[PDB]
Amino acid sequence: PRWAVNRPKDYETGRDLHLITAKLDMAIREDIMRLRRIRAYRGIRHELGLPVRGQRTRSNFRRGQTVGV
Amino acid sequence: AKPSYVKFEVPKELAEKALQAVEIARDTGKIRKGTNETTKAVERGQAKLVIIAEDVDPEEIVAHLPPLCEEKEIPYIYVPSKKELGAAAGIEVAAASVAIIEPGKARDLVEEIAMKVRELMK
Amino acid sequence: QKARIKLASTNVRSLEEVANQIKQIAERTGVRMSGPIPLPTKRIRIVTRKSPDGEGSATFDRWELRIHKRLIDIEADERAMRQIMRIRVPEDVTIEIELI
Amino acid sequence: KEFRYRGYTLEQLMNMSLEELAKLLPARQRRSLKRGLTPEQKKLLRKIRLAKKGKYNKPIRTHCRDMIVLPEMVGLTIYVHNGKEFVPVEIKPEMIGHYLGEFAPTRKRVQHGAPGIGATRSSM
Amino acid sequence: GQKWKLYIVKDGKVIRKNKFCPRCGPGVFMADHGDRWACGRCGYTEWKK
Amino acid sequence: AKADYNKRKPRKFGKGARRCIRCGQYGPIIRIHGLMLCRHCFREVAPKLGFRKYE
RNA sequence: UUAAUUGGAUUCAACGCCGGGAACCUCACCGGGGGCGACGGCAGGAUGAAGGCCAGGCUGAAGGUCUUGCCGGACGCGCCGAG
Ligand SMILES: [Mg+2]
Ligand SMILES: [Mg+2]
Ligand SMILES: [Mg+2]
Ligand SMILES: [Zn+2]
């Protein structure tokens, strides 16, 4: 069925495709690069390494070292 | 209209029936002043007693009622002065034409003076 | 040929008085009346915070309002129908009559 | 290396009815178009079409951050309010199907300073 | 001041340059837009000659 | 017109569509069984309405 | 940190608390645009106050303002007290 493939309604050809391994990786990278070129909000969030889907960042998502006073 | 417009003389009876016959009708009637407001009134025949004072200069907005006198019945009289014209019917300002429609108990004198003006000059 | 009467009030005693009056009216006449059936009570419960501000321990009020009900069936007899139509109920009792 | 959105060139996208185009956008945009445009978006679209016709040679400034980018808007420059100012956006073909507000950030990037008094248990 | 003119009025004949609204009666006057009848209160898209 | 710049929009949902009938406050409105009262106002008028604290 | 990231509460007895799960409203913050002075009086005002509008500019959008002229008839924040 067409609703089971992992890339339906392709952005370039418009068809329903299933990708594996290197082609899948390069397709995902291309999608993120497209978001970055047009300077969209999600592209900036990808560039800065910050949560993309609207999470709060004051409490969790902490990855670093303690800063003293 | 304006004293510098020779229409006829200044009868005392015309003033008596034009000025002293509205105070008894002011409390039992309506008043519509203003040349522009009355112009629509006379044009559609809304007015009933048109007392045209000779106080408005120049002959710009006043040269509309005499030209319209022959177009409708327009029972009209003339007023000598304006200062008490507004006081007689209206408010403490200078009045140019106080039109009263359907006055109360002001029929005999107004009708007689209207007939007198009809036989006087039209 | 039968009438159904529904009674509801927030005071039990007034409801009992009205029911007893209807019962006696039926008794003083030749007419069969199914006894007053007690329907389940309505409870309206509201729980609220007590303090106006938010400081201090949290404590709650539990307010409750109770509504009692009764059901009476009687056969339509004009001699008995007029009497129950003229009985006067207190202002805190609701009555409704229908013919089935 | 040209631009194609579902296998369609830019010209083919230009000569499409609004209903035809909505079948190619994602679900959210299709629903938004299916419910019609708000009056403010109607006025903005009128100004855009007037500019395309060769009239209205003035900057196009707007408050409508929720307007969906359409193919006929490609090539213009629009100033979208971000809360205190209008920032310029140059529409590229790959922006079809996105909201305008996606290109006008509302917050400034954060550069942390030294933690102050009360930032740790021992600093109070 | 005073705005009552542009109506062709001579010694005894009064005619109005500005017509009245067909929705209303006489006395009301339109503007002088020249493109169309402003009508003052109702508005008309007529392309007055 | 100048008066049009003082009238509010007639909303039908949201916190702005409901006010306490006794004090006019927005927010903590009790909507049970048609009551429209603040949690503050309901405490001090509950006995008059016939409510009681049985337990 | 920021244009603003509204404010109250700091041991038990502050921190899923203010019934606080805020897309608009809520809203108290930030950027921008409009509106409001019963009642007394002062300039003013039917030779028309105060007020309202077809189209078109300014504008995020707006008779809000201006352009263009059409309306309505008795009050009057341009000024002082007061609300
Ligand atoms: Mg909560
Ligand atoms: Mg929420
Ligand atoms: Mg909000
Ligand atoms: Zn309340």
Domain boundaries defined on chain F? 1-55
Q: Which one-letter DSSP state was computed for residue A43?
A: H
Q: Quick count: other Cβ atoms within 10 Å of Cβ D86?
A: 16
Crossing angle of the two packed helices C12-27 and C78-86, in degrees rounded to 10 = 150
Q: Which residue of D has its CA nearest to A68?
A: D115
Number of domains into which chain C is organized: 1
Beta strand pairing call for B97-101 and B30-32 = antiparallel
**One-letter identity of residue D94:** E
Are the C-beta atoms of A55 and D119 separated by less than 8 Å?
Answer: no
DSSP D68-109: BP-GGGTT-EEEEE-SSSEEEEE--GGGTT-BGGGGS--SPP
Range of the domain at D1: 1-124
Q: Which one-letter DSSP state was computed for residue C46?
A: E
Per DSSP, the three-state class of A68 is coil
Range of the domain at C11: 1-100
Length E17 CA → G56 C1' (Å) = 24
Range of the domain at B54: 1-122
Check C64 against F46: CB less than 8 A apart. no
Give the gyration radius of chain B's Cα atoms: 13
Nucleotide nearest to D107 (CA to C1'): G2
Answer whether D19 touches A (CB < 8 Å): no
Would the CA dihedral through D47, D50, D56, D60 be positive or negative? positive
> Residue B106 has which token pair?
């002001």
What kind of experiment solved this structure? cryo-EM
Q: Tell me which ligand sits closest to the C-alpha of residue A54.
A: 2
Q: F4-30 b/e with 16+ CB inside 10 Å = b?
A: eeeeeeeeeeeeeeeebeeeeeeeebe
Residue holding tokens 């006489």?
E26
Burial category of B105 from C-beta neighbours within 10 Å (exposed 0-12, middle 13-18, buried 19 and up): exposed
Per DSSP, the three-state class of B109 is helix
In Å, what resolution does this model reach?
A: 2.8
CA–CA separation, D7 and C79 (whole Å): 89
Number of domains into which chain B is organized: 1
Nucleotide nearest to B97 (CA to C1'): G46
Beta strand pairing call for C2-9 and C93-99 = antiparallel
Strand partners of residue C47? C62
Number of domains into which chain D is organized: 1
Residues 6 or more apart whose Cβ sits within 8 Å of residue B83: B94
Per DSSP, the three-state class of E13 is coil
CA–CA separation, F18 and F32 (whole Å): 13
Answer whether E12 touches B (CB < 8 Å): yes
Are the C-beta atoms of A29 and A37 separated by less than 8 Å?
Answer: no
Are the C-beta atoms of C41 and C67 separated by less than 8 Å?
Answer: yes
Q: Which one-letter DSSP state was computed for residue A56?
A: -
Cis peptide before B58 (omega within 30 of 0): yes
Q: Which residue of F has its CA nearest to C11?
A: F50
CA–CA separation, B75 and E7 (whole Å): 24
| Nearest-neighbour CA in chain C from F53: distance (Å) | 5
**Phi and psi angles of residue C16, each rounded to the nearest 5 degrees, phi first:** -65, -40
Nearest CB partner across the interface for C62, out of F32, F40, F55: F55
**One-letter identity of residue C83:** Q
Are the C-beta atoms of B43 and E26 separated by less than 8 Å?
Answer: yes
**One-letter identity of residue F42:** F
